Design an enzyme around this catalytic site. Sequence first.
Site, PDB file in Angstrom:
ATOM      1  N   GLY A  20       0.792  -1.230   0.000  1.00  0.00           N
ATOM      2  CA  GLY A  20       0.000   0.000   0.000  1.00  0.00           C
ATOM      3  C   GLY A  20       0.824   1.279   0.000  1.00  0.00           C
ATOM      4  O   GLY A  20       1.914   1.315   0.574  1.00  0.00           O
ATOM      5  N   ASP A 133     -18.123   7.223   3.701  1.00  0.00           N
ATOM      6  CA  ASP A 133     -17.405   6.975   2.453  1.00  0.00           C
ATOM      7  C   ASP A 133     -17.015   5.487   2.259  1.00  0.00           C
ATOM      8  O   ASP A 133     -15.855   5.169   1.984  1.00  0.00           O
ATOM      9  CB  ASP A 133     -16.191   7.915   2.344  1.00  0.00           C
ATOM     10  CG  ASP A 133     -15.836   8.251   0.912  1.00  0.00           C
ATOM     11  OD1 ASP A 133     -15.077   7.474   0.291  1.00  0.00           O
ATOM     12  OD2 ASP A 133     -16.327   9.284   0.407  1.00  0.00           O
TER      13      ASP A 133
HETATM   14  C1  DYK Z   1      -0.374  -9.327   0.621  1.00  0.00           C
HETATM   15  O1  DYK Z   1      -1.206  -8.431   1.363  1.00  0.00           O
HETATM   16  C2  DYK Z   1      -2.011  -7.570   0.666  1.00  0.00           C
HETATM   17  C3  DYK Z   1      -1.994  -7.413  -0.714  1.00  0.00           C
HETATM   18  C4  DYK Z   1      -2.858  -6.499  -1.302  1.00  0.00           C
HETATM   19  O2  DYK Z   1      -2.825  -6.317  -2.670  1.00  0.00           O
HETATM   20  C5  DYK Z   1      -1.992  -5.170  -3.088  1.00  0.00           C
HETATM   21  C6  DYK Z   1      -2.865  -3.931  -3.144  1.00  0.00           C
HETATM   22  C7  DYK Z   1      -3.772  -3.971  -4.373  1.00  0.00           C
HETATM   23  N1  DYK Z   1      -2.990  -4.110  -5.600  1.00  0.00           N
HETATM   24  C8  DYK Z   1      -3.857  -4.048  -6.773  1.00  0.00           C
HETATM   25  C9  DYK Z   1      -2.248  -5.371  -5.569  1.00  0.00           C
HETATM   26  C10 DYK Z   1      -1.263  -5.405  -4.396  1.00  0.00           C
HETATM   27  C11 DYK Z   1      -3.771  -5.781  -0.536  1.00  0.00           C
HETATM   28  C12 DYK Z   1      -3.813  -5.958   0.835  1.00  0.00           C
HETATM   29  C13 DYK Z   1      -2.924  -6.835   1.461  1.00  0.00           C
HETATM   30  N2  DYK Z   1      -2.929  -7.044   2.862  1.00  0.00           N
HETATM   31  C14 DYK Z   1      -3.139  -6.093   3.821  1.00  0.00           C
HETATM   32  N3  DYK Z   1      -3.113  -6.448   5.122  1.00  0.00           N
HETATM   33  C15 DYK Z   1      -3.314  -5.445   5.996  1.00  0.00           C
HETATM   34  C16 DYK Z   1      -3.544  -4.136   5.612  1.00  0.00           C
HETATM   35  C17 DYK Z   1      -3.551  -3.882   4.246  1.00  0.00           C
HETATM   36  C18 DYK Z   1      -3.786  -2.534   3.708  1.00  0.00           C
HETATM   37  C19 DYK Z   1      -3.692  -2.158   2.390  1.00  0.00           C
HETATM   38  N4  DYK Z   1      -3.985  -0.828   2.254  1.00  0.00           N
HETATM   39  C20 DYK Z   1      -4.283  -0.297   3.491  1.00  0.00           C
HETATM   40  C21 DYK Z   1      -4.637   0.984   3.906  1.00  0.00           C
HETATM   41  N5  DYK Z   1      -4.879   1.267   5.195  1.00  0.00           N
HETATM   42  C22 DYK Z   1      -4.763   0.277   6.094  1.00  0.00           C
HETATM   43  C23 DYK Z   1      -4.418  -1.032   5.780  1.00  0.00           C
HETATM   44  C24 DYK Z   1      -4.168  -1.329   4.443  1.00  0.00           C
HETATM   45  N6  DYK Z   1      -3.350  -4.852   3.342  1.00  0.00           N
END
Ligand code: DYK
Length: 249
Positions: A20, A133
């Site tokens: 992220g 939102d």
């Molecule tokens: C392999 O773990 C992941 C891969 C993932 O995919 C990516 C993001 C999306 N693109 C398209 C592809 C790559 C998305 C989420 C996760 N896990 C995860 N765990 C905890 C928090 C978050 C998170 C992502 N943003 C945030 C914004 N504020 C708080 C928390 C988060 N995220």
Amino acid sequence: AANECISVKGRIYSILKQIGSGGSSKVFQVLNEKKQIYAIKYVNLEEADNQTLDSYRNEIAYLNKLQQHSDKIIRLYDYEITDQYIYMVMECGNIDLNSWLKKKIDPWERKSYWKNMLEAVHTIHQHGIVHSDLKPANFLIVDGMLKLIDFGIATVNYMPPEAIKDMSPKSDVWSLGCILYYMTYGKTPFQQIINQISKLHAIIDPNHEIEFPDIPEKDLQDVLKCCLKRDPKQRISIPELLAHPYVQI
Ligand SMILES: COc1cc(OC2CCN(C)CC2)ccc1Nc1nccc(-c2c[nH]c3cnccc23)n1
């Protein structure tokens, strides 16, 4: 591909990859001392004003408190707050809902996910939080279940008519319904329109009726029609959706 580390409360975490990035923040997939996987959110507070600082402090307070109440809210394990930054040690999800939907659902999975969302939004409403939102980016897939990521404290597709009119917990019901309408039909009620200016006029005008194609799950059709009532007074509530046949029978 290097030995990049983050220190949170004296505990060292080796960075695996960046999952992220947005504004003045980054989210990393990390490994701890005992080689376990967690996620770390980094917030840079260098250019933040007193209002932005308070909104981040408020989200951390609610996040740490609400955690005990529901397992459908992202688990916060630790945090570090200084005048210069915030580090939040969280549970690691596999992927967010918005990304998962872009490459897509099973009827049992759609219902299972809906129950998770209702439980999460219900839990934030009980504490006087109205997200305002809500969208799929706000939900994370962790061990086959959806978990809420933020509370709105810190795409016009999921926007309710009230929000456009103002330019209520019922506003989250409209956004939740829009997500379920996406998992049911594969599109947003207004997605079809390319011109974003015309899109806002359709959400306000009741002369424009939302399309509801007939599906086998008759109860699921009723939920969507109840969630997408333009008058928030006529619109279904969260205690009502938990008692709805779609969720129960
Ligand atoms: C392999 O773990 C992941 C891969 C993932 O995919 C990516 C993001 C999306 N693109 C398209 C592809 C790559 C998305 C989420 C996760 N896990 C995860 N765990 C905890 C928090 C978050 C998170 C992502 N943003 C945030 C914004 N504020 C708080 C928390 C988060 N995220």
